[PDB]
Amino acid sequence: QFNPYGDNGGTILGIAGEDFAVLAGDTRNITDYSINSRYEPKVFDCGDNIVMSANGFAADGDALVKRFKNSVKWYHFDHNDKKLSINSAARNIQHLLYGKRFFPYYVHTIIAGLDEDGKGAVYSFDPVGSYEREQCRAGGAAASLIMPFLDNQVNFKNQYEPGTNGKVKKPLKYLSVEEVIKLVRDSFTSATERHIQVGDGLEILIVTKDGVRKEFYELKRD
Amino acid sequence: NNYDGDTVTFSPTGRLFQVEYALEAIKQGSVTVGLRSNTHAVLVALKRNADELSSYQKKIIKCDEHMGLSLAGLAPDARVLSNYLRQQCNYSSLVFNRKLAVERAGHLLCDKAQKNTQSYGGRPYGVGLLIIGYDKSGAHLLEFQPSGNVTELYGTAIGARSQGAKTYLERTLDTFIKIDGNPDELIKAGVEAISQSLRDESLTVDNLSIAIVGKDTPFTIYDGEAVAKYI
Amino acid sequence: DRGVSTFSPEGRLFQVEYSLEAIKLGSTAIGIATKEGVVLGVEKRATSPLLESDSIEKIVEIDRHIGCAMSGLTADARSMIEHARTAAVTHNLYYDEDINVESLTQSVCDLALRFGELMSRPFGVALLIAGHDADDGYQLFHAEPSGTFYRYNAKAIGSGSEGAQAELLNEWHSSLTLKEAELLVLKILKQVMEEKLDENNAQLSCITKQDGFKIYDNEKTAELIKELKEKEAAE
Amino acid sequence: MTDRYSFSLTTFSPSGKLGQIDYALTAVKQGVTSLGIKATNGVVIATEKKSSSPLAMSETLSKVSLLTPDIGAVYSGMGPDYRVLVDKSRKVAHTSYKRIYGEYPPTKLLVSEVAKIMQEATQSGGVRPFGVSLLIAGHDEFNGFSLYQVDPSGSYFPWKATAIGKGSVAAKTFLEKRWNDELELEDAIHIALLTLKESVEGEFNGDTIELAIIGDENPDLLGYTGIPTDKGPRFRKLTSQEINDRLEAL
Amino acid sequence: ATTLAFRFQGGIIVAVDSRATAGNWVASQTVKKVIEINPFLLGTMAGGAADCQFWETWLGSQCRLHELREKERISVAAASKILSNLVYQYKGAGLSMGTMICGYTRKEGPTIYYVDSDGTRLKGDIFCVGSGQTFAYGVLDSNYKWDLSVEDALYLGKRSILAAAHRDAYSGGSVNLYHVTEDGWIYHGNHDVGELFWKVKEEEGSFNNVIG
Amino acid sequence: GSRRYDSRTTIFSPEGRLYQVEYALESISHAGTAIGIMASDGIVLAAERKVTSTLLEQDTSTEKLYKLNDKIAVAVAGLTADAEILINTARIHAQNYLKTYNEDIPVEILVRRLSDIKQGYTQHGGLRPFGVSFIYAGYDDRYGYQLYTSNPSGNYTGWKAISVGANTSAAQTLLQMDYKDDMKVDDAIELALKTLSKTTDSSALTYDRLEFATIRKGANDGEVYQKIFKPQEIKDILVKTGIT
Amino acid sequence: GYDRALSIFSPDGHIFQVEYALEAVKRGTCAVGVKGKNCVVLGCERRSTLKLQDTRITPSKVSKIDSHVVLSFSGLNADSRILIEKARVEAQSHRLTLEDPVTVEYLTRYVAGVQQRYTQSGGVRPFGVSTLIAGFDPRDDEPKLYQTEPSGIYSSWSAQTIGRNSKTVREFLEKNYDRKEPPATVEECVKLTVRSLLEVVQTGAKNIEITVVKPDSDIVALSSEEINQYVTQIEQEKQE
Amino acid sequence: TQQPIVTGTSVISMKYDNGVIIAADNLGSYGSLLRFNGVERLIPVGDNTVVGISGDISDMQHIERLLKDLVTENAYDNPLADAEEALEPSYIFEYLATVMYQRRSKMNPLWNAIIVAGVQSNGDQFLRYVNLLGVTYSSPTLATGFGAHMANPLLRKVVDRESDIPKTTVQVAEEAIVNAMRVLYYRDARSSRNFSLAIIDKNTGLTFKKNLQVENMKWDFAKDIKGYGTQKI
C-alpha cells in the first residue's frame, strides 16, 4: 500500500525577545537511518520581515512555505502593497493548513517576526491549523529534549531566590539577542548529543526592525 | 453598418467593426509612453481625473518583479488582462522556477484577446497595453492591441494625441537606445516624449506616473512627489 | 436585436451608458471627506405621505469602518451590499484585520462588468463608499456600473448631481471640520431637492475612526437643520 | 459551438395559428398518396413507390416499414423524416415497453409514443416539426385490429379507413362509398388497389406499388419452431407477384 | 482539558484549564480554550483544537453578518444552531468538537448551549466537558445555587477547574475565568494552577492528602 | 448568432400582457366546446369533437375526455398532443402523492401542480406555452365535488358550471340562465347537452360528434364512480333528453 | 439553457420589461392595506365579471405565509403563486435555522429580493405582481405593513393600495388617514378599509373581501354578511 | 496506488570543481529476474542536463516522454531556444518536482527516485533529488536506493562538504564514481556489470559514455574459503 507521508527528521526552535525574534533549525535531512543532506535549508525568509519553518514531512513543508510565500505576493497585489503583519500571516496560515484538514500537511509550523508594536513575536501551529502566539517553542524530533530546558532557562520555572526557600520566584528579566543565541546553540548541541536525527549544522535567522540576518554554526556530523 | 452588431461578423471588405470600435476606446484614453535602452525600460503615463475633487486614475500595473504594463482605454479590461499576466508570470515561476519571457507574455496576451474576437456572446477587450520588462535577453517593450496584435518596439505611445510622442521617439531613436546605465536620463527622454502629446494641460505632481525596470532594478512605480524631480 | 456586451462606434458599451441614464433619475446622494471623518447624506424622496419614510434605507453599513450611500435603481444595490459585507467579513476571517476601503471598493467593482449572454445586465445603481483605514485615512469612493471607481474629496450622485458638484467645487477645502461638512451636505441637499428639506425626507450619516459608521437620528439631524437655517439668516 | 438555439422555433401567431405545424401539413399535402383500410380480420396499408430515377432500385427504398411483428407503418411527406421516425419508433417499442413488460406494445400505445416524439419537435428548442403524416396499422390481443393517423402536431386519430397526401380528399370520398363493417381482408386489399389507382399517373403494377397487411399469424415467417405460444408475425409485406395476381381480378 | 460553564443569577461563569497534550507529552501550558466569538458570545475548546478554533471564529463571522443584515444582536439559540448545523454537514468526516456556546441577551437571558461534533445541541444550566469533566462536576453539583453572587460563582468555577487540574493528568497549567453579562463578557484573569493550588489549600483547608 | 431567430416567447407587451398566452388563448377559441356542470350528487363533463368523418373509429377514439385517476377527470380544449404531455405528468403527480401519503390526491393540489407547470413556460425557458385549456372534474373527502379550469397562463379558478373552447361567451350565458344550486346530475346532464346543442357550429348535435362523462356517488354506497360514456350510451341520452 | 437577456436598459435608462410588468399590476384587481393601532386590515377587490364562480374553492386573494403574516397582491395570478410558495418555504426555513418566525420586514425583503433577481437574470421575465405584506413580528404588538413591486424595491406604509384605480383609493386614504391617530379599534380600521374600496368597487356585495390580522397569530377573514353590515352603515351615514 | 513491476536500481552522482557526474546501470529487473539488460536510465535534456531515474521503468518511460515534450514546447515561438531561453537544469527539476508531488497528492504516484544533474547558465553546478513522495533535497553527493547506503559513504570521502568541491578534479570524481559502481555490483543483488556514465562540465559540455563495464574485480580470494565454520576440505 502506498504511504503518501514520510519523516525527514529535523528540529526547529523559535524564541521571541523584547524587540527581536529568532527562528533556528538544524540543516540535516534524513530518511530512516540515512542522511540525505548535511545542509538542506529549513528556515526561510518569506518577505515582510517574516521567517517561517514547516518541520516534519519535507515535501509538505516545502509546499506550505511555497504557498505562504505566494500568499504574501498576492496580498501585496490585492491590497496596495500593504505589509502583511505577523498576526495576519498567522491567521492566513491557519486557513492554508485547515484547507487540507482531511488530508493534512504533515508538519509542525513555526513563524517568527515582530508585531505591530515592534515587539518580538513567535506563532506555533499544529498540522491542521490550530495556532497560538508563544514566547518560546521548539518543534520536530528533539522538541521534547529542548522545551523543558527552555522552561527552566528562559521562563525560570522551578527557580526561586536563594534565602527565601520557595517563597519568592526568580524574577523574569528580559534576555538580549546574544543571550538567546547562546541558549539556542546549547539547546541544539545538547539535542545533537542525544538525538540521532539532529546534527551537521545549525542555521539561525534573526529578525529585528532592521531586517532579517543569518547565522550558521557547525554541529556534530555523526 | 449592418455588420457591426457583433464580433462574429465580417464586413463585405473583410473588416471586424466591433474590434475597430474597441480600438476606438483606446484613442479616447489618456496618453501613455513606452521606451527602452539596452539596460532599462521605462513607462510614462498621463493620468486623468474626473474633476478637481477626484483622484487621478492609475495607469500603471505591476505584473511581476521583472514585468509590468501601462493602460489606455477601459480600465477594468486592463485589470482582467493584467491579472491574467500575473497568473502566467506566477505559473512560470512556481512550476519551472523560471521568469516568464516578455516575448512569451505578449504571445499569451495575443491569444487571450483573439478568442474574444471569433466567438458569439463575447466582446473584444476595450484597452491597449504597453508592456515593459527585463528578462534573460535584456530590456523589452511591447505594444498590445485588443485585435490581438502584439508588437515588440524600441519605443511607442498609445492614447489620445499619442502621434506627437511617437514621432518624437522616431526622431530620438538613435539617442535614447544608447542611454545605458543611466535610469534618470532614460526617464527624462520619456517625460520629454509624452510632453509632445500635451495640450492646455501640463505635467503636475499628481498628474504624472512613471515606471521603470532594468538590469538591477525591480519593476517600481513612481507617483506623487517621487516624480517632482522630473517635472 | 443586438448583443448585451456590444460596443458603440465611439468605443463605449451601450448597456453601461444606458445604466448611467437610470442613475441620473435616482434621488440625490452626497459625500464629503474631511480629516475628522467622511459624511454621507441622501434624499429619501417618498412617493406618498402614507409611506413611512424611516423604512427608506439608502444609507447602509458595510462594516464598522465602512459605510455606503446609493442612487438609482436601489433594488440592484442589495446584492452589491451583500457582496461588500461578505468581502469585508471574509477578509477579516482570513487576515485578522480590517480590509482597506479601496480593496473593498475594488471587490464591489469586480461585479460590475460580469454581465452578458453571470447576470443579464449591468447594475442600475451608483454607490458612494466612505470609510477609514490606517494606511490611507478617511476616504470616499464613487463606484459605477462600468467597473470604474474614482476617489473623491467630495462627490454628488443622482438627479441633482451636476448642480451639487459645482457647489462642492466651491465649498470644499482641506481644513473642513466634521460639523462644517454635515451642514454643507444639508445645504446642498436642500438646494437640489424638489420638496422642502427636513429630518423625515433627508438622512445624514458619518464614519469616524473612534465611533465607526453611524446613521444619524432624526432628532440629531433636525438640530443640524435648525443650525443651518440660523447661520444662513446670519448674513 | 454548442446548440445555442434553446428557444422554440414554432410559436403562436396573433391569429392563434402555429405556423410551422401548418407548413409541415402543407409539405405532407405535396407528398405521394398513401392509404389504410381496416377489415374485420385484418388491416391493409398501401402507397405508390414514386421512383426518382429508373436507374434507382426502388426495392431498396421501403416506404412501408415493420415497427413490431404485429405493427406496420406508411407515410406521406418527407421521406428522410419518416426513416428516422421509424428508427425511433422501433427503439421506443423496446425501451419503454418490451424491456419492461416482456411483450410488444399495443398499437394505440406505440402510436402514443410516436405522437409524443412528434409533439416534442413542435415545442422543444432549436428544431422544426416533422414533415410527415403517418398511418400506423396493427393488432394486439385485447384491442384487436386498429388503424391510426399521426400528424406533425402529434395529434392522432383512429380510422376505419383513410388516406393522406396528394389525392387524399378524393380518396377519402372513394373509401366512404366502399367501406362497411363486414369487409374481409381480401375485400379491403381490392378496395385499396382500386382507390390507389386513381392517384397514380404512370405505371400501376407490383413493382410501382408498395402494400402490406396486418392479418393472420405467419408461423412460416417466425424462423423457429418449438414454442406453441409463439405463432409468428401478423405484419406481412406483399410481394410484387402477389400484387399483380390481384390486379388481374381488378 | 477541562472546561465548564454554568448559568446563575448574575449571568454565566465560564472556566477552563490551559493544558494541551500529545500522548503523554505536554505540548503547551498556555492554551487559550475560551474562544472570544465576539464581545457578547463565548465558546469553549474541547476535542480538536483546530476544529474548535477555526469553526468558532467562522461562527463569529456569521454572527457579524447576521446583525449587519437584521440590525439586531443574534440570539444564543440562533448562533449555537449555525455551528451545530455546520458540523452536522461534516458528520462522519472526523471533526472532533465539544463546546459550550455562551451568551446573555434580552429575549433569552443568560443561555448556554452544549454543541458537539456528532450533531448534538443541548440547552442547559450546567455543562462540563473534557478529560477532567467528572472531577469538576463533583464540585459544581455540591456547591451550585442559582442565587450565588458574582464573586462566589467566579470562585466556584475556579475551584472546580483546580479539582480537575489536580486529579486529571491531561488537565492543568492555568485557569482562565470569564463572566458573561448582558452588556458583554468580562475577563477575570489567568491563574497559574501551581500557585493557585497552594493558595487554596492553605486558605480553604482542602487537599489534606497533599503535603505542603 | 442565434439571437436573430429568437421569438422571445416569455415577454410582456407594452400593455402588460403575455403575447404567447394571448395567442394560445386565441387558438383554444377555435377548439371544440367543452362544458362542465357541478351538481349536489355529482359532476357532468360534456364535449364536442371537431368536424369528424364517417370513417373515424369513434369507440376507440379519445380527444376530449381523459382519466387522471379514479376520482379526477379532465376535458380538453386545444392542441390534443400538448394536452397528453400534461395529462401524463398529472397522472404521475397523483401517483406520487398516493405513494407518499397513502391517500388520494385532493383535487385542488393536482390542479395547482399542472397550473404551475403551465406558468413556468410563460416566465422562463424561452419555449412556447401549451395551447391547452382544461376543465377538471373531481371528488375528494374535503370539498366534495369540484370543478376547475386552467389555461395557458397557468391561472386556475373554481366553478359551479363552466365552458372552454369555442363559443364560451354564448355557452356561459346559457349556463348562467338555467343553472340552480339545488340541481341534480340528471338535470345537469340535460343542461350540458342543451347548451352544446344551441352553441354548436354544426347543423345538428349527434352521438358521433360528442364525448360524455359523469362523476357520481351513484356508486354503491360511500364511494365515487367515473363513467366515460360509450357511443351507444351517448346516443341513448340524446334520445332521453329529446335532442334527437 | 435559455440565457437571453430579456430585461435590458434602453437609451433613456429604462428597463421596459420591468415597467411593462407594472402595467400588468395596473390591470389587476385593487388591493388595499390599512394598519390601525392594534391591527392591520387587508381589503381586496373581486371583479363581478365572473359569476357562477365557486367561492369555496376559488383561490382567495389573501394568503397566509405563516400563522402571523399574510400576503395579498395585484397583477398576474399565476405569477403570485410562485412568490407565495417561495415565501412559505423561506418562512419554515427561517423557523428551522433561527428558531424564531420571520419578521414582517424580513419576509418582505426576501420576496422583494426574488422579484429583483428576475430583473437581471438571463432567460427570465420579471414578475407581473406587486404585493402587500402585513402582520406582527413575534412577541410584538406593533402593526406592520409593507409593499413590494416588480423592480424589487420595497417600503413600509401606514396605508397603501395597489392595482386598478389605486390612484383613486390612495387619494381617499391620503385625506382620510391621520397618522397622529390611526383607527384605534378593529371596527374603525375595517370601516376605513371598506370605505376606501367603495370609492372604486361598484356593488358592495361579493366584490369586497376583508381580512383582519391581530397580534399573536390572530388572523380571520370576514364573511359576506359581516362586510355587508359595514357597507350598509357607511351609505346610511352618507345620506346626509 | 500501485506497485512497481519492472524496476531500475541505484542512480549515483556527485559535484566536482567544474561540473557534475552521474551514473546508472543498464538493468531492468522483474522482481528477482534480471529481465532486461539494455535499459538506458540516464536521459539527457539538451546539452546542459542529465536526468537519472530509478524505480518503475514504465513510469520512467512516461517521464522520458514528458521531458521530450518539454523540449518541443520550449522551442515554440522562442527565437532564443538554443541560447538565453534554453532549458536550465533548475527549470527541468522544478517541473519534475511539481509533477511528483502532485501525483503523490492524488494518491497515484510515479514510483521513482530521480536525480537531476546539470550546469546552469552562470556555470553553477546543479544537483538535486526528488522521489515518489515529492521529497526534495540537495547535497554534494546524491544517490538513490542501494547507492544511498553504499555509494554516498565512498563519495563523501572525496567531497565531504561544500568547500571540497573546488578541490575535486573530474578525474578524481569519475574515479570515485566508477569505484562506487563496482562496489554496488559486488553487493546489490539487483545490479548489473554494464552501466552508463554522464559528465556535465561548464567548459567541455556534456560527455555521455555508454557500454561501460565494471572491471578490476577481486575474486581470487574466494578459492581459499571453504565450508561455513569447521570444514577444511
Ligand SMILES: [Mg+2]
Ligand atoms: Mg546527532
